[PDB]
């Protein structure tokens, strides 16, 4: 007497290609899929422009010192983050 639905699986790449084709193409270039002759796809490689990372540990876990080296790293990340937000805002501010 289980209410849990049956689980039929599929490879991660298989699901991604149907949900977001752009991400799938980017992953192939990063994961070095164009170096081996046997596994080389026919489609030409796509250039990588933007990536996303998580900086929670680098900001609040990893750099506790008061030296200029640790302060500079945190400030640069904060400054870059604000620039990204401002670019998004400018795209919407105009009437």
């Amino acid at each position: 007497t289980t209410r849990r639905r049956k689980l039929l699986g599929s490879r991660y790449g298989a699901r991604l290609a149907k949900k977001n084709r752009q991400q799938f193409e980017r992953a192939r270039v990063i994961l070095d899929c164009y170096s081996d002759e046997e596994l080389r796809p026919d489609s030409p490689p796509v250039a990588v422009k933007e990536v996303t990372i998580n900086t929670l540990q680098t900001m609040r876990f990893l750099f506790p010192q008061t030296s200029k080296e640790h302060l500079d790293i945190k400030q640069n990340i904060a400054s870059y983050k604000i620039f990204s937000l401002n670019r998004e805002l400018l795209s919407l501010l105009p009437k």
């Binding site: 689980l7 039929l8 699986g9 599929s10 490879r11 991660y12 298989a14």
Partner: protein, 221 residues
């Protein structure tokens, strides 16, 4: 077999120790009396020194940090009249006989069954036969590799189960997938250097870890 030997408290038996049993489950909660019984295998009293020493201290006295894996047996179970048994007359020193091998050999096979999750002996025998055919020069290391390649033990290494027994139940419930889908022959196969394991019961496993470490989590965020 609703025996006491199939419970964690009495799972492992060793006849060469002062207390015959041995504790191998890192998450078992013992009572005060039980802890006292097990502690007798850790502390020993030296007559000439008039002090208590521990097993770790004994290794330091022998200058043992990294030793050949076959030499650790002589340190755990034997005694020396110049380091740890100084002051005892030679007449009362214990020396083993060639007739004690069978008890030791049977005990070690029982350990392999316990680590794998209370497996049957025929299961271990076939595992040994499998390694005889695989490539490699050191027989001892091939056995070790086979144990690691087992799926249920690998799930335990990930850190999502308290012990191997809990990991086995998770496989029967299909809480972990192999290469994107539930595994086939999950109890009999070996994992390869490029296999990918993922949790499908994400909500269940997250609750398990949070509850375990709730008391050791700081009260300041």
């Amino acid at each position: 077999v609703y025996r006491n030997s199939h419970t964690k408290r009495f799972s492992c038996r060793n006849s060469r120790l002062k207390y015959p049993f041995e504790q191998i489950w890192p998450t078992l909660q013992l009572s005060e009396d039980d802890a006292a019984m097990f502690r007798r295998n850790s502390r020993q009293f030296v007559v000439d020194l008039s002090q208590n020493i521990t097993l770790k201290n004994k290794f330091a006295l022998n200058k043992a940090t990294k030793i050949p894996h076959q030499d650790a047996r002589a340190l755990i179970y034997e005694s020396n009249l110049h380091l740890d048994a100084v002051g005892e007359h030679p007449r009362y020193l214990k020396i083993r006989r060639v007739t004690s091998q069978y008890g030791s050999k049977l005990m070690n096979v029982r350990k392999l069954r316990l680590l794998l999750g209370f497996k049957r002996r025929n299961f271990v025998q076939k595992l040994y036969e499998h390694t005889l055919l695989q490539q490699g020069s050191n027989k001892s290391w091939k056995v070790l590799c086979a144990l690691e390649a087992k799926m249920n033990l690998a799930v335990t290494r990930m850190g999502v189960a308290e012990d191997v027994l809990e990991a086995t139940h998770d496989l029967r419930q299909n809480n972990v997938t192999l290469n994107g889908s539930p595994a086939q022959m999950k109890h009999a196969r070996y994992l390869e250097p490029a296999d990918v394991l993922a949790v499908s019961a994400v909500s269940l496993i997250k609750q398990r870890i949070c509850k375990g470490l709730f008391e050791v989590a700081p009260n300041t965020l």
